[model samples]
Target chain A: QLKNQIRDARKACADATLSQITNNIDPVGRIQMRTRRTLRGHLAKIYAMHWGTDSRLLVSASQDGKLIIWDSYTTNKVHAIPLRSSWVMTCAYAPSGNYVACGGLDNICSIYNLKTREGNVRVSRELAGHTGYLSCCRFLDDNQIVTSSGDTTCALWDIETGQQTTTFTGHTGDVMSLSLAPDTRLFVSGACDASAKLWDVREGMCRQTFTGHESDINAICFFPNGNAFATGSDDATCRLFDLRADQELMTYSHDNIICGITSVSFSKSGRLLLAGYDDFNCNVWDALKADRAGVLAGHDNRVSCLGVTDDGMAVATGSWDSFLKIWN
Target chain B: TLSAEDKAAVERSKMIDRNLREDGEKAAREVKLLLLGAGESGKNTIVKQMKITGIVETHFTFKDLHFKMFDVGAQRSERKKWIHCFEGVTAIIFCVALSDYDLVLNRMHASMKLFDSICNNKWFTDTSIILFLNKKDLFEEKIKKSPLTICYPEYAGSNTYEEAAAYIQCQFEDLNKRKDTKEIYTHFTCSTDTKNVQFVFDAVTDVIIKNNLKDCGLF
Candidate 1:
């Protein structure tokens, strides 16, 4: 009987492990507990962060103008690029992983070649034209970049020629954030003017103006399908707009959330929308249902930026507390 | 009887159809124009001209061109507000007071510097610029007594109204002739003259309509 009891115990342990796997894979299952990893190094507030396409690397920008690339798996520093501008607000990695672009109060966007073996990774090309502080920069493709500025415009630059290919203007306030569609043909910008505009790169025209935000729109993200986009505003609400409907489709707001949204991202499956707020919390919501999913909390200060991995299994957030945390 | 899969396919088709309709409707009408210049350069007067033309008064339904005109102030205190108006601007209407040469020429110089900054700005890449050498009535009177050299030493002491206006216009043209700057359209006007103002308005309207059509590929 004792021998049978030992065998039963072993069988029970195996059954539990199998059920756990099944629970993780099941669509109707409860939210699984995620592993949390924290990265610390920056001496100032972290303003922006992005996940590299490969999922193994993460890049973050800080108020001190440092771009730190971290090995996500090992949670160790890979490279810390010191920028000349003291207020580096945004950074983006090339889709090919060969270059990194950063911009800030210097009114210039600098592209650095990461593949070079030089002791000092100097800027490969400097895109200088914005008269105001550069707010955000992103690689539209391997050969092009789009940067938004407080000068109230977003410009698409040809990486090869280092010349601006197109300028998108329409906002009546500072262009604070930008998000490119999955196809790279269109982009959306949010601004202090309390409006978000959809822009076409080829024609250099404003496609649609979404004007419902009561305050400054601080962050924006495109839906996975590119048929819609979302904006988070200082009005303390997140709005989703459908390009097809040409109007707002839904709004995600919470009573407990009292601060402006600083950053926003959508999951790969488009089922979830994640928003980082100035209140030191990352709020997740059901994209379709427009209900609060859960809050990822731990940061001691305002959560400034957020990025999600490609597979939708991990989320990385940077905050004023100078900590980068990855939730998986 | 329709299967669930068939029902889903039908819903998808409806969505695609709706999106196509919205896209078509959006292409019909929308333009954002910005008014920029130095403080008291009559930028507001140009906006007033639009209002008098009935374009800025009622909802734009005639040509279906919805125009949003932003007059960003140009004072030292308000210059910071100009950057906020730069995004997605369909065109920039840069106004200047030719008569202010002696009174506030330094301010006009500052405005020229601001114009140069805007021309070099990457955001206005395809945006057209309309230069309104405004307050020409004052300029016509002032040029009778004041030498152009008082404000612009490069003018070589020319006092003729035509020469003075041409020199000032040249100064603006030289500043905006950057490598990839947009086409600059220059016009001389007194905003108070209803007839001349109306004529200039018609020209600006044509330029905007033509550009809008060209932008939409329907020109």
Candidate 2:
């Protein structure tokens, strides 16, 4: 029995090494294309990106305080909206499809409308409340938007009047990523404080606190049905929670720190789970079976951002490798 | 077949019994206390007071501490359901109006029957009991009436309160004589106006502690 146990241990060690080698070899072959464009010539790294509602437009922002709207699918710059001179970190699409909200180093957020063309873009609204660099922004409803930042607060915004609604506050540290519930007045916010909190946008109250991840929870998204939600953490794992039971139903392990998981979306019918990770790969998982369906790879650096269209026929990811690639 | 009305009444009783259980101990305690008195009695008022004091709420967790106080109606029909509510109770407050001796006799007989049944049932054999002779303030007015007033048939010269109080004390004595298992530790003649209600409540608490009645879990 002792000899058999030793033999099994040796086999396990060999499998671990072989898996690592295969991973580095890019067995999934995710990095399918390499087209490098000088995106505002930033010396630092580009950390966040998003595709506008238009399939033709893409927005990229970086720590160097430059907001570049790229028409990379065509090798020309369509529009470059420099935010109010701060290191911009994250950007999101509004439901209206005409404007995009970006958060950054200035402790304020700028909503840039896309239709007006050129540097004629003005901040449709200025969201202020965060005492530090803003990290993420997203539309809560057609009329309101939410943004989280290092100030440990998430503020709700009025789209027309640009007035700040009640700000939801509870996180002990900088909030990282946020996702609004699809059809309800609820949204989930994750933070570097190793906690994820659910907030009711209508009431401005912290409804529930989810704690289990050992590190900062970087992103959170609701299932299309709103019965459950998932969170990605720096602990190298993703957890799915069933709101009905108020318990963690499952946890998925990853190989690297999950820096930001933007497009943790389901198929149009919510049958499949598609998520992009910091590992430079977008994965398709059988959400019900809790198994991997496939891995799509193409970006050279960590895919820190992701967004899937409402139909779910395609997925777009923004990566540190300086590119926004769409998957069909 | 029996009349439809009789069947409906049976169904209503069953539903009320189920509600008294499902709404759980708090509402059951309130309902029990309400039926334990005369018409226009302060039973409902006491319930309002208890609710205002934060004693009753939707959910109850502690099995034993669940029923701090229960007031079950001494009426013939009301007292029949009192046994089901007595499962985890510590003390039963027997409210008797000091002036209505006929009602007292009618109610106390049902109360004795309930006590007998509980003693026979294994569940509540050790339950402590408190007897409250309520409405003690009407005695002076009864004594001062003129002969003509007393001579009237409706307000006749019957010393019913005195007779009923003596019968109650004798009933306890008789029970003690019959068996050592029957115990009655506290009896108080109380009036809502006299402020002797606190004394009755204190006596009820004493009986609960002295008998170590905390063992009946399910409050």
Candidate 3:
């Protein structure tokens, strides 16, 4: 009976879903992935990281009490700025590439100037108003940032003024993660309520809400085109929500693949979806067909954080194993 | 009258001899369960649980056989000196931490290498293995975020504890180089949970008892 039930379910999903290769979408990327290099040096777990606009540079925050920026091409540590606290939960490279920001369990977002600084860089300013831990941050430009928090709020702060510009407050739970639209003030945030909200800085309000996950949603990433986004959840699913239709266009899930996702991103074409899983593998999915493309192997621990370069020429992943890997 | 007394004495001595043989078998019937694995795999916790449990209650068929679970230092430094002193071992109850899936040569990776060595060891050619994938509680929570794929990249199964665990069991099972003869048994364990430990311990008791009977020519 169980054999038949399992087979029946498998048949339904395997044949009846969008896994079919539609000719228009092609369901495959023009480029394949290879393990380009390994960036090793973090002695502790790296939970926060970001790729710079330059695409060759990136920053990773580790619990080892130090944040290191790396030139991934040469695999060199450009700067290893010691953090003000070891409890950091988020990190972001400013879009302008002039500064980097990170914060964590201390409920403070600290900004560090990186304009060819001398030997050591210090926190130039600290945004400290949230009652809960800072979960995610993004730089709108060199002058402003939008940060999500466990305090069930996402705030926009002015860099030079050190003031909270506007706080988006429609979510019912802590905002676990956030992704900003490409070249727009619109951002999406996912959290414990199993729902994701698309927020607008113009209205300073929630514009749309996406809900399909059955459990807590932890990670969100915008498509390169910014019309749609994906949310990774503890429910073991990645839902691609299209803003135009205001509906989930494709959902990437498997019957036997039960591990919740930790982070998500998209290629420049927005065709290939990269997700770091609780299972040590970072899987590539055909964003349109929802078919599995391949696996990025080699990590012996769960891949907790991941980033795709601006050009999508390469991808970056940081594991709980304290190793960062680059792939192209 | 002399013949009758001699016949009765012979019968009485034969009965005593049978009892003596049975007593000897009982006294010598200790189940030698050798515990081995990577250092952080909860061998000490399982050993502590072993002491707290009496004789694995509810093992009516496997009655009265004493269990002698042996432990050794699991560190890499201490493993180099592993002597061939373990003979007549009924089974090797190898312990491993499932929660270490996301670690490097650091923890989970080291555990697998150690298991492979012990599983295919020359001394253990005839020894059956009982793999304790310990820390099911921690593993269950972890699978919600970190996956079993860290160690097993090709793993395509769901991330549920059952699927991941079964997949891990297969990993250890398939490592039996002597596939035709070596038998490896696996169990999901939480060393701290007395119920889980007791249940799995009792289950292993059956294995030891059945195998022990065969070794003793008890049919």
Candidate 4:
């Protein structure tokens, strides 16, 4: 019976992958073009990249502490922010779309105002707590943001008042990825310790440590209702975890390393998930059905970045290909 | 009427609650049973064997007797943190590499310090001890160059297992004498091999029965 269950899950994943690829190749009478403009100058490697509020803006960072914002739709560089002291590993946009918080190597966080330009170069706040390179950060709400670092701690910061409300510590290794739980007090974090943990901010404790991922978990995202979440791993497989029962509902594997995952909101009615990988493709999956939806193949190298607009009408991805691509 | 799904949920929650209470009780009962000495002392292996055999495993039979065992690393640094895991253990099974008695004596100073802390703890006043003198079969080859004979009679005695048992009793007696207390018991285990495991099992059972711990609802 266990073997049969495994087989059925594998078959379902394959079917989802086939349907997604087919949909992308032959969209329902929509015209999309793949652009080729390189957004270059990342030192070691670009590990994370995301689009701002609209297709007009882009923000991406690398393991080298370089942050670049581009005119994504027009393929032009608008601003480049180089963090001199520490390497910036991950960046996330605030809910309001005017601020970007980037985690750096020196165990500190840097917040940048997108509206400010030129000699002003205003550094909003230098948040501290983690002892190692900050691996991931995201806005919990417009007033607050959560950040995780290689120091094995995650902190909740008040972006508006510049005060750290609380620090959650429990991971045995560096925290690599973090995702907020859909307008709630819950969020999930993946770490080098080979486990993904769910945190309840209101209660100030960990709700669960979702183990079973054989390698470091790289990315995590919760469904719209917070009943389930998905994690992408270095093990080259993406697992769908059910929060209610605390079990892996299903798993989907790809040809290369899964780097990050983002859920679609406007497009596909938030039913599709965009998985960015090391092989330069954004693999889409049917989140509800727990099946592969399709692969968005355009970049020439690793697809290290991904973002889905609030409306879900479009997706923006950045890659080692040196270019950012926006797809409809 | 409870539906099947509701029934299963209740069963799982009850089991989890029961295990938590049992773990708390066990931690409060014992001091430290340092699973000490060398690679493959059969510490982790024994835990796995017990789990598979359903000895430490529990179903949804109760809500306060769930048992989960941890196989602590034998490394020096790892042992310091392991002190916290001894919270409520009624009995401690100290596994030793019997074949390497010489090596065991060499590291005796450090091992004694760990055991001393457990014995000193006020909560561990009546904690029972079970010694797993493992690797009996390898003792013959291990004694090749040593003047110390690899005979159970010398360490345990030939006249009866009681003599060998008395030999072990003396070691604990000496340690407790230093602490000004004579509250300890001892037993022997041959090796962790499945065929040899029966000895350790019987010895452990005997200690538990002797201590009158059957009514604790943990076993």
Give i-RMS (Å) per prediction: 19.2, 35.8, 32.3, 23.3
Give the range of the ten consecutive residues with the poorest summed lDDT in model 3 chain B: B53-62
Q: Candidate 2 residues B1-219, lDDT tens each?
A: 668865664565455445434533433342111123444345545444333411122222232333334333322221221243234455544444444423333444455555455445554565554554544556435433423232223433444556544655666445432343335544544424233445444554565565555446421
Fnat (0 to 1) per candidate:
0.00, 0.00, 0.00, 0.00
In model 1, pairs of residues that clash are A152-B87, A169-B87, A169-B88, A169-B89, A170-B87, A170-B88, A170-B89, A171-B87
Docking class of 1: incorrect
Where does model 3 sit among the CAPRI classes? incorrect
| TM-score for candidate 3 | 0.57
Give the per-residue lDDT digits (tens) of candidate 3, residues A1-328. Answer: 9656745654454433344445456546544577879877676678888998889789998765568787777665556677746556789998778788888665687999887437457668888878666788788887789988767889999989999989888767778888888776788888778888888887787776767789888788887878878888877888887787665656788886887888988889877788888779888887776778888788886787998888677888999788888887
Tens digit of per-residue lDDT, candidate 1, span B82-174: 353254566777787777767643767777888898876755776778778777778788778665666765647556777767777787888
B1-219: candidate 3 lDDT, tens digit per residue: 568755664565455445434643653555566777765777777766655611111111124456666565521221321223354577777787878855665575577677777776766777778777777778889888776556666657777777776777777787667864556777776445566455545756666676677779783
Candidate 2: residue B45 lDDT (0-100): 57
Candidate 2 chain B, run of 10 with poorest lDDT = B53-62
**Candidate 1 total steric clashes:** 8
Q: Write the per-residue lDDT of candidate 2 for residues A217-247, one digit (tens) a residue.
A: 6667788888788777656577787665555
Provide the overall lDDT of each model, using Cα atoms, as 2-decimal numbers.
Answer: 0.72, 0.57, 0.73, 0.58
Stretches of candidate 2 above 4 Å error?
A1-44, A52-56, A70-77, A117-119, A254-263, B1-219
TM, every model: 0.56, 0.49, 0.57, 0.50
Candidate that beats the other on DockQ, 2 or 3, i.e. the better one: 3
